[PDB]
Amino acid sequence: KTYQSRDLVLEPIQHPKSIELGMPEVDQSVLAEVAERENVIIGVRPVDEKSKSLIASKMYSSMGLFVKAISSDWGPMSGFIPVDQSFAKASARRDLEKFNEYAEQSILSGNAVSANLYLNQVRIEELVSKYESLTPLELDVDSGMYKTTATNGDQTIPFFLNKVTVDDKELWQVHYLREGELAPFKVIGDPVSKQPMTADYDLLTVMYTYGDLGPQDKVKSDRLKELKDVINTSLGRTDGLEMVHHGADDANPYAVMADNFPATFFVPKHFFDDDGLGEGKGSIQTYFNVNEQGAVVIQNPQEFSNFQQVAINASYRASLNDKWNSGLDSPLFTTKRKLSHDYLDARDEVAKKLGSPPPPPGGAGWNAYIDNLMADGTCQDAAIVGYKDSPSVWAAVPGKTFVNITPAEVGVLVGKDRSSFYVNGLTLGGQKCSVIRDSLLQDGEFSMDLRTKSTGGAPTFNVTVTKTDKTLVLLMGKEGVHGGLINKKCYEMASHLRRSQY
Amino acid sequence: TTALVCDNGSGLVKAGFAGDDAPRAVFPSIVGRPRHQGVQKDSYVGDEAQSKRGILTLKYPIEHGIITNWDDMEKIWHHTFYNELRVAPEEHPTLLTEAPLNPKANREKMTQIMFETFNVPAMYVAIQAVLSLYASGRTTGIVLDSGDGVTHNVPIYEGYALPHAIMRLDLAGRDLTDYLMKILTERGYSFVTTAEREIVRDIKEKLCYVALDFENEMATAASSSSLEKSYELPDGQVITIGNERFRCPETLFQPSFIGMESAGIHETTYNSIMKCDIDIRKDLYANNVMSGGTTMYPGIADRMQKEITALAPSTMKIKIIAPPERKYSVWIGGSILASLSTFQQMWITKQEYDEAGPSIVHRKCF
Ligand SMILES: C/C1=C/C(=O)O[C@@H]2C[C@@H](CC[C@H](C)/C=C\CC1)O[C@@](O)([C@@H]1CSC(=O)N1)C2
Ligand SMILES: Nc1ncnc2c1ncn2[C@@H]1O[C@H](COP(=O)(O)OP(=O)(O)O)[C@@H](O)[C@H]1O
Ligand SMILES: [Mg+2]
């Protein structure tokens, strides 16, 4: 039951635990269905747990692009981006001028509006009772509002909540003392819906099947834009209250492990079958924590790296056209570490699978020519054979194949017929060979390239034959020696012989 | 130092680095020059040539797998090195791919351009089908490579293509897109222009499939709507694609659909095997590898399995391999080959080129 592919070893999860996620499970089910229908793997950055009810209410808009003012983690504005950044997280409170300018510029550039903040009864109960973020509400008889303070952030600031009816909903409007006077609390809202922005569903990565990879149809990412539209359509929010936004903000020089994990991944349903990670290899839920809604929960960088490898192995990859930040505190995120196992296995397989004689010019024996051909250690056999009149081996490596070449075999090599040897090859010293290239009649080559034929898994070897005015120069490489190296060597010796009228 | 891998496709250039599992760049094999020849750039390549199509004349320099315009091909290589990969070619050994049966004069010209124009330190030219066989983890087998402008059956023995037995079919993805435009136009729609060809190429890639039994599927399409799929056109109109889903790739098996008198891909596979030594034929039947974009149709491997089985001796063991990454297997095979230690012994060095000239490619590359 253990998953094994090269250096990737995954052991079954003993006692699967339930992991808390910020994304409402109704939307997790939607994203699981989108991954199946679209045949893609979608990764979504964690949503802050405390913002779940805000998203579940389906009343708000979500964080769009070009908003550099940050959210608050305290008071009744928790989970929203206050226009007055003194009400935001500690990093904004200690850099007021910088953050207040970001909020103001977001409005001035048409990227946000200043909106009123209404909270539902669920939110008031969460802040008072579940999280104890606010002190119990106390009716202030003069204004008719309920006063409360935050139990974190600045505990000296009073907030005032007023019961209002907004489009048939009984909500609580947030008010505060602005320059000492009661005023409606303002948050950054979306420019088209005018509704406050909560956290959005920030896509971490999208991995597509091979068929969906390739050049774009941009006649000036379209696939990612199209997928985001399918997601928003399937999420079914009112127009203007979308959870996913087209485009993406800068990578940002920040880390925080809570901003990247636990990430929720959504995958095609075939990953959940018994042969999910391959024939008899097990289902993805055996090695990764998957909930009832089909969300694959990735808790840390090692799990993210392992999940990415399983997806890559299953032929799902991030696009060339798409831009992702995905990683953060990288264990082995380089391209060289995430290579497909089909690529590495094929490379390993290929590396394994690839492995009266006249006096010679000078007058000092033909054996010196054989010694020359055998010197660089690339060849196991070499021969110089006269082919005119009665053919004979002038010189050859003793105890090898070429020394036994016959006149019948020479006749096939130099014969007029250049097609019968394609039926089942030819022999050289009795050794069966296949013809790879017959360039015997090509000017400037006068050569034939062959490869021996053998039984089972016994090695085979490349052979080149080059024809001169009176001789055939034959060479056989050792195991693994490329045919081009042998052809070049045979060509060079043949040229030398042709220069001396041989 | 990293070797570069450039797959010079009839429709798409796939380029990248050896040792990577996918190309870094995939772009159209087109060059665009301003329409008025008798006259702020002299020429445009790929994506940019398509974006500025309103002011340029577009041409495919490798229309049918064979390079015909060397000036436009040099622009493609320059774009690939400098603009897509952002490398200095003189610093990298470069593996180029070539069509099966590429003319000697063509591979000589490609070698000369690499060394004389780009000054690469070393280069090699590999047959595309051989690289796809390597990407499947094999050295012996028969590859059916169907791309944009050309289709070939390539039998291979231990890494060496057997040119006497290579079969070429002058029909590929581009012809299938043209045929789909014709049969949709027959229904009252109009798909005629270059831009409409691109819409139909999208329809073809998203909805077409190979039927296991064509006549049975034609009968089903005429008796029910179970095979119909809807496609939204750029103008908002919706078109229903029915029997066109499988009539379009049926042309691979029946080239008479487009007026061609050629045998189908199953018949050319048999013919190609039969042109090889008797001794290797069992190994070829058991190792049929599908490669190229035009082999992506769902159902194509099961149809090839049925068709080859019907042709071959009944005891023949037949196996069709259609990798999920087969659109890029030529490139992937080149990355495998150029990342192996045996590759340094195979490349043609500048020293070897200086000594022998362009004809060195005949000796070293096969
Ligand atoms: C997305 C894409 C795919 C492709 O395969 O593109 C290649 C290259 C392309 C060049 C012209 C085109 C207008 C430009 C870009 C399209 C690139 O032509 C093709 O689309 C041709 C024409 S229709 C067909 O099936 N092949 C194939
Ligand atoms: N999913 C698919 N279904 C059918 N045809 C496809 C698919 N994907 C790509 N193609 C087609 O494959 C061709 C491009 O394939 P490729 O092997 O890159 O060609 P080349 O190497 O000749 O440039 C085009 O005709 C394209 O429409
Ligand atoms: Mg190709």
Numbering used by the authors:
A (entry chain B): 466 to 685, 728 to 862, 895 to 1041
B (entry chain A): 5 to 43, 49 to 375
Publication text:
ExoY virulence factors are members of a family of bacterial nucleotidyl cyclases (NCs) that are activated by specific eukaryotic cofactors and overproduce cyclic purine and pyrimidine nucleotides in host cells. Here, we explore the Vibrio nigripulchritudo Multifunctional-Autoprocessing Repeats-in-ToXin (MARTX) ExoY effector domain (Vn-ExoY) as a model for ExoY-type members that interact with monomeric (G-actin) instead of filamentous (F-actin) actin. While Pa-ExoY requires actin filaments (F-actin) for maximal activation, Vn-ExoY is selectively activated by G-actin in vitro. The catalytic domain of NC toxins can be divided into subdomains CA and CB, with the catalytic site located in a groove at their interface.
To avoid the indirect effects of ATP depletion through Vn-ExoY AC activity, we used an inactive double mutant K528M/K535I, hereafter referred to as Vn-ExoYDM (corresponding to Pa-ExoYK81M/K88I). To improve the crystallisation strategy, we designed a chimeric protein containing three fused functional domains: Vn-ExoY extended at the C-terminus (Vn-ExoY455-896, either wild-type or with K528M/K535I), a short profilin-binding proline-rich motif (PRM) and profilin (VnE/VnEDM-PRM-Prof). Using this chimera (wild-type or double-mutant), we solved two crystal structures at 1.7 Å resolution: (i) VnEDM-PRM-Prof bound to actin-ADP with latrunculin B (LatB), and (ii) VnE-PRM-Prof bound to actin-ADP without LatB. In these structures, profilin is bound to actin-ADP, the PRM to profilin, Vn-ExoY to actin, while residues 863–895 connecting the C-terminus of Vn-ExoY to the PRM are disordered. Vn-ExoY contacts actin-ADP via its switch A and C, but only switch C is fully ordered. The Vn-ExoY switch A disorder (residues 682–727) is close to the LatB-binding site in actin. (D) Structure of the nucleotide-free VnEDM-PRM-Prof chimera bound to actin-ADP-LatB.
